[model samples]
Target: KNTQTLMPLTERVNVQADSARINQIIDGCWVAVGTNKPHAIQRDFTNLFDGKPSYRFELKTEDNTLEGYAKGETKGRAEFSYCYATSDDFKGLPADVYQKAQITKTVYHHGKGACPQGSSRDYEFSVYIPSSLDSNVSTIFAQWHGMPDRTLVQTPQGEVKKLTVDEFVELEKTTFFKKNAGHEKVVRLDKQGNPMKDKNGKPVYKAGKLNGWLVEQGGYPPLAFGFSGGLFYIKANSDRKWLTDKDDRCNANPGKTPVMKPLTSEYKASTIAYKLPFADFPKDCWITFRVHIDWTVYGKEAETIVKPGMLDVRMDYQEQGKKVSKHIVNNEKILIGRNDEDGYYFKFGIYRVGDSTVPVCYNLAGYSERLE
Candidate 1:
């Protein structure tokens, strides 16, 4: 309804991205979000996938780094919101996050291609991380992002029921916007999701019910490929109950260091201390990730499952004339995700944090996914 580029898929299914790349789509089930510059992402016919077609994703430290409109664009009509451009680590607030050309798994906004809870799926994608990409700068090559929490309401009679999607939307408009305390005189936006001045300018944010413009509370993706600090790593996370259902988090006063359990834990979440170092990473080769996950968003099964997930990722390197082998990386039983509803979706290419140096690019081909 917004634009051709904005219409997402309507169902969950397998994706053989070679076909979509041929027609110039990012991938069959992916939507290219957060793009401001045309060179942010483009198709390269020369770099073929087994003599077919492929995509190139490039990002400068300044590439689409802002989260809202330029000077003239309105919030309602804007393409990228600051709320979603930096959708990991936290839900969305202004930060020093670097935005790049990323294709988000798009579905079920008005329709259901989102990878739902209680479902199992396999995901695979081939990436070409050249030596030129700033190895020192951190990046997320691939991420399966978590969805917004579903609405839950408690009655005066002491009963709680999860609201229907439609009801939740209605509640957001009617009661949620005023949840934060304060009254706004003339709240304007350029930050779009917070109390801030417009793109044109000044400090008017003293009050005005400063809360997200209906932004979701997101933490990390359940699983991801972390290209950081000269090491390639994998992080898998799970939550039996994601912050009290109505969603609560760190509020009390703490000491020198804050303590949140088990992100470093072996059972609920864990990050392989280090995987293949960037020094040993293959240059200009197709690095592939093949993953199988039996998602458990409901607490009922997540804690009890013997084996929750496994990721088999590797790189296929080609020498001047020699054909090399696959350097297989991670194969471990790790936790996947927690409880939530809009469902997890895949995002790929240059999702970075920090204001580092400029200009890094990667290519992607042979992406496929299947639901179980």
Candidate 2:
């Protein structure tokens, strides 16, 4: 861990909830432990576990530490990291004010009840913010990785917005590749030198992310793996019209000048997911990702791009009626992780317009493999 290279100071910092809105603030930001057993956290103080369920709340009063316990019929010990959210890092965030935003709670069992494999139930807690946070701040982001539920207080109005970590985790799981399935194929040259399609009659050559480099056998060379390392690169500041020319595969060839376009609303809000054709991938291989968030347009034109390096990628909250707006811009390079197994996860921190740098990452945790 390179503490010097973008150390996360917010995780260790604690807020004092001594005022009327302290409960709201605590619910929004307090850290909690998660275990293999199913658990949920909410503001209503409802029992997350009915009969065989039980839990304990531990915090850092002495030295920014954590503790845990079992809930319900289970009595064994539980171990997990404490996760929480940070200060505002989003645009249009209101200045300090506390609102008891309606909080919802959900909890899924690890194997029983509503719990999916590698998943947990979610709980929500609403909190209020004091009228002290700066309004000029373009971004209001949060950070809470690997924990259960958390609270988000809309500053100025103190309106509370709460969500479960599990819900967000579920979003990561289901949104990948849009549940589309098809047979894998590889393109090869036939004896006559004509393009060859695989047995399924599907063309082996398809435009999408490639995913066979890391786990392939025989130590294939770079040339063997066609395409740009199984992913595409987009500049944060470029205009919408320039994207297709620069990236559409058939247009604007790389190495020459990158296709340029003046940023337009038409290209502003959109959700784009690329699927690497199996033919382009090596057999039984894993995948890695590298995302570039250009600084020139850090916060103004851009919001945050979550889980940049996962199989299923999404541009958060940048959607129009049924479409996603590409309003979020990035001015930095985000290196998300690699996944050998099948699932989606997040990589980069939050960056809004006008900010000089990226905000600390909120909700930095892995997802469960089990699905309901």
Candidate 3:
């Protein structure tokens, strides 16, 4: 028997990034929360004054430096701060303490007649992440205001990206807007890969609510993708490819590479109904984006399969002891691809549905274009 470990020509994790780059990554990257907030930072003591808790915060780059903000909350009112470990000196401590230290100071103030007296506080000190930060396994710490006794650590850690205010603003806009424009189209594919006609002989596009709209509190990182509306950018170049063996953790099933298609715009139009930046994405990451709309509100399972032979989205949501089945719920697969440069485009009716697979989509209606 032979044993061997395969290595990619390039490392998937950015462990070799310098201190400046790592700091930039962490600083510029905003924290994304898909599940519930960490319990350590949600107790009563940590959230005094009936202060609303911040499940997630973003560190935006500004003036060549960085500033932090709690997502979905007003800046001044929310009690927020973060810190990191410079090296192994403190790494021996529990995962939580080894990464961050939060020190916030509070003060009391009395208000005038109509307005009652109140107290306010400012976060003091900072967190540090060393140059030795590794993307595969690293930790980050947080200590909420007034929670002096206990420090909170972000578990299941990885390399954090530091995004500038503008970049964060753009990404946030894309995130929110995509959620807001949750319109899905229903389409039937013909032999040549174009929308088929209905019984009345009218062109049809499938539409519905995407499964990816609902999410766990802090499970996965939030990502955004773009599309082209009918009255917008013309489809310039489009292509499709089969999944290959080189795809990591992606090809659990050999000989069954799901086909995908990507379309690019020939001329940039001012009114791009669906648009998102294609840069800053790491080389080989896999991502899919779509618009969804549903008339009735009911629960359904949202699952993505990373299996080798069957790589696609699945909708088998279980609610109240009821199991929902998967279907061709909508026709809004605006963009889908693995991050190879040639693989970055999508067009209507370019690919076919897998034999036993379901794909996930996002609802754009419930979202906005900006945080404010």
Candidate 4:
């Protein structure tokens, strides 16, 4: 019953990381998207938990090798980082291209995170710990969808104009940080469905909710909080944990901690940790990922178009002379090309949660892309 033909959108095969190559790819192909700065891809590694340095994109090249860093520290704050393709870049493709496309890359991880004072921090990279407390979460790879709006606006120069695609992207960047870059409030509840009071007769509170500055629209920011793919990891207090269903109302709302379903049986919600298939996966090992997106075509004949669509992700690694793999599917209809805006983009890196000073690292060996 398979009627779709496989067409290449982007492909990266065993390509070594180098400065020239990194610059060529990023400059000509990618855009640094997130709450952080856009142009220069450097981060303040010294202060990993500072709100000012919560999200960062650091690309390094040494001895003709390249390594990209997508680091996030949720110490008393929330943040997200992504490197995606530009709208113009994506829309420039041929209309005859297949709605289905794929992206693949190799990743390396070294176990490093918030450890006890003067303790050995060297541990095997097995599971991803999103947070040590409640309402903290993180994602390693995701496809971000942008909402289409035809509303017109006035510029700072008093110029009224319809929102251009590029302008919308800029607004999205600002709104992303404003809506998702700050500390969260902790609340205590009693069995009676009321807030518990402390000895001072005042309501007890903590500082670890993932709420940000701006009010969320449709339960999320106006931009790209809507995502589908590998959730990688999530953490909450002993009372709350587990990856929930893929609804924006569930995934984007940080205020209500729902008793969600766990994606895996080995998930230890109480311990605030979930093991990926690569359990006990060693350090310095190479892992490869293939992400395929199938868009839904719409519009009239020659004027027909496609928008943000379905997602199928595959991850693989070699162990003891055998190959192991994992797969994930996101069937939810995502926002793609609406209001004349282009489609979504792909991103991958480390995005952590909570007030833990964990220094996470990702070693990328290969990257490529294709369109069909």
Q: Top TM-score: which candidate number?
A: 1
Q: lDDT by residue for model 3 over 1-372, one digit each (tens)?
A: 333221111101111111112322222321111111222112122211213221211111111111122233221111111221133323355643321221111000010001110111121121112222222211112211111101111112322233333333333222321221212334558889987887898576543543222111111001112221111111111111111111111111111211222212221101111221223212121122222221111111111212111111212333355655343223332322221111110111001011211111111111111111
TM accuracy, model 4: 0.35
Worst 10 residues of 3 by lDDT: 104-113
C-alpha lDDT of residue 8 in model 4: 14
Each candidate: RMSD: 11.5, 24.9, 28.2, 19.9
lDDT of each: 0.49, 0.22, 0.20, 0.28
* RMSD of model 3 against the true structure: 28.2
Stretch of 10 with least lDDT, candidate 4:
103-112
- What value of lDDT does candidate 4 attain over all alpha carbons? 0.28
Q: How would you encode candidate 2's per-residue C-alpha lDDT over 194-279 as one tens digit per residue?
A: 78777988444432332211110110000000122222222222222211111221112112323232122332321122223223
Stretches of candidate 3 exceeding 4 Å from the true structure:
1-263, 266-311, 327-335, 338-372
Model 2: which ten-residue window has the lowest total lDDT? 216-225
The all-Cα superposition gives candidate 1 an RMSD in Å to the true structure of 11.5
- Which candidate's lDDT is highest? 1
- Point out where model 1 deviates above 4 Å: 1-29, 64-112, 150-161, 174-216, 243-268, 300-307, 319-331, 354-358
The alpha-carbon lDDT assigned to residue 228 of candidate 4 equals 15
Candidate 4 structure quality by residue, lDDT tens digits, 1-372: 232222111212221111112432332433233322221133333223312222232211111122122234232111121232222322556532211111111000001111111111111112112222122223332223322122233344544345543454444333322222223455667789788899889676544543423221111111121111222322211101111111222222222222223222121111112233222333334555554434433331122333333334455676688988865332323321222222222333333322233333333323343452
